[PDB]
């Protein structure tokens, strides 16, 4: 019932640089006793949430004081004075002043790294899958940065948006890249009616789209 | 403060 | 050390029941209010239920009020959530947490609940080998397409775990009450072949294992 709004949704930061996250509530979190029950927590990929801040600016004793919290009323900020690689994760603000407890939607903090081009591979449907009357063409686009990529499927030269299923990994905690799979599933009969299959990647790292293709015959 | 049960405003202090 | 270990999650039909528990240790359980939270598949966090140290006061948001019951056994250091009339929206990773310091201080590891009338289905596992020609001499990437299973999770390894670097296993996507996922592995050519490469897929819900050899062709 208290609306908690976080900004930005994602924040890209270089290691050693400061970062700042904002949290705005729909009504004041200050209670009559003079305390403001506004909290921050971090969830690292695949981990449990960990407390960072309580009562606006009190620091959890497991958290280094490069993290500070400030604000009052309806406006709150978490700052990180200098980001480290282990700060990667989703930051949430949440309030306990008004029943029921409510959370902000989360801010994803990502680590900046040097540009990296995707390694692109295309795989025609397996012959076992065709015997069951389905045809998935898979394209992998591995280890790239920034996260911003567009991928187009082209059947016989024709861009195709229908039947695609895309999926992305979290930012790798070891090289800070991203990876994605893009899967075009057709019925076998329509797989049959075309020759040419193209996975096409657009990325800031090359002056021309990265093209991978096959042709049945 | 030092001091109190440190509960949120909508909690009734427990036994 | 504060430690909270949830168990009891699984796949349940809409309308059905499940009871979660949380084993607490490393602290005086009886002194603290305790809470349930959940994390939705979209990574939204939500508060689910809270209970006073003693047991007498229970608190619930409107979303679960009337359906779930939180209770605790102070004698066995155990917290419970009895979930009734489950809904698909209740699908989430459920966390036990300790209330302290004007909020919540420690969280558990989570137990996963899926609420769905869709049936348990084992995956079809399809090998992905490069097409007839044929980019890069040097490294070669191979794939496994794991299609059409329910519910989550499956696990995917390569060569029973001994190929680990160069692996990307993507999150599953749910389509028509079936999940699909893929995994790629990247190895030196000259290693493939000869040397054999196998994706090992396990799906505990269906007690199934598939070990699929990637062979040249498709």
UniProtKB/TrEMBL annotation, chain B:
**UniProt-annotated location(s):** Host nucleus, Host nucleolus
Q: Which family does it belong to?
A: Belongs to the lentiviruses Tat family.
How is this protein named in the record?
A: Protein Tat
Report where the shown chain sits in the full-length sequence: first residue, last residue, total length: 2 to 16 of 72
């Amino acid at each position: 019932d208290v609306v908690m709004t976080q900004t930005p949704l994602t924040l890209s930061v270089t290691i050693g640089q400061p970062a700042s996250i904002s949290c705005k509530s729909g009504q004041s979190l200050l209670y009559s006793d003079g305390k403001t029950y506004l909290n921050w927590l971090l969830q690292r990929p695949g981990q449990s949430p960990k407390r960072l801040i309580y009562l606006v600016s009190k620091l959890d004793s497991g958290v280094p004081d490069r993290f500070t919290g400030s604000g009052s009323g309806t406006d709150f900020t978490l700052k990180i004075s200098r980001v480290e690689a282990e700060d990667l994760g989703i930051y949430y603000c949440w309030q306990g002043t008004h029943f029921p407890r409510t959370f902000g939607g989360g801010t994803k903090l990502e680590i900046k790294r040097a540009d990296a081009a995707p390694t692109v591979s295309i795989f025609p449907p397996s012959s076992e899958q065709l015997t069951s009357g389905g045809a998935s063409v898979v394209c992998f686009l591995n280890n790239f940065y920034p996260k911003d990529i567009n991928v187009k499927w082209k059947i016989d030269g024709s861009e195709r948006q229908n039947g695609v299923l895309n999926s992305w990994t979290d930012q790798d905690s070891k090289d800070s890249t991203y990876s994605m799979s893009s899967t075009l599933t057709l019925t076998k009969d329509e797989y049959e009616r075309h020759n040419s299959y193209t996975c096409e990647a657009t990325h800031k790292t090359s002056t021309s789209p990265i093209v991978k293709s096959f042709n049945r015959n | 403060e030092p001091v109190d049960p440190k509960l949120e405003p909508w909690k009734h202090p427990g036994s | 050390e504060v430690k909270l270990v949830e168990s009891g999650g699984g796949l349940v039909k809409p309308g059905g029941s499940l009871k979660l528990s949380c084993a607490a240790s490393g602290f005086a359980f009886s002194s603290y209010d305790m809470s349930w939270f959940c994390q939705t598949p979209e990574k939204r966090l939500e508060w689910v239920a809270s209970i006073s140290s003693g047991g007498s006061y229970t608190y619930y948001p409107d979303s679960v009020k009337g359906r779930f019951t939180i209770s605790r056994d102070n004698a066995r250091n155990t917290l419970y959530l009895q979930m009734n009339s489950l809904r698909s929206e209740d699908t989430a990773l459920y966390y036990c947490a300790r209330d302290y310091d004007y909020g919540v201080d420690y969280w558990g590891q989570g137990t996963s609940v899926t609420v769905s009338s869709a049936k348990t289905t084992p995956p079809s596992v399809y090998p992905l080998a490069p097409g007839s020609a044929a980019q890069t001499n040097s490294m070669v990437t191979l794939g496994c397409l794991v299609k059409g299973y329910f519910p989550e999770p499956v696990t995917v390894t390569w060569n029973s775990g001994s190929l680990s670097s160069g692996v990307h296993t993507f999150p599953a996507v749910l389509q028509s009450d079936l999940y699909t996922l893929s995994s790629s592995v990247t190895v030196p050519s000259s290693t493939w072949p000869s040397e054999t490469v196998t994706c090992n897929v396990a799906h505990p819900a269906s007690s199934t294992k598939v070990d699929k050899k990637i062979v040249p062709r498709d």
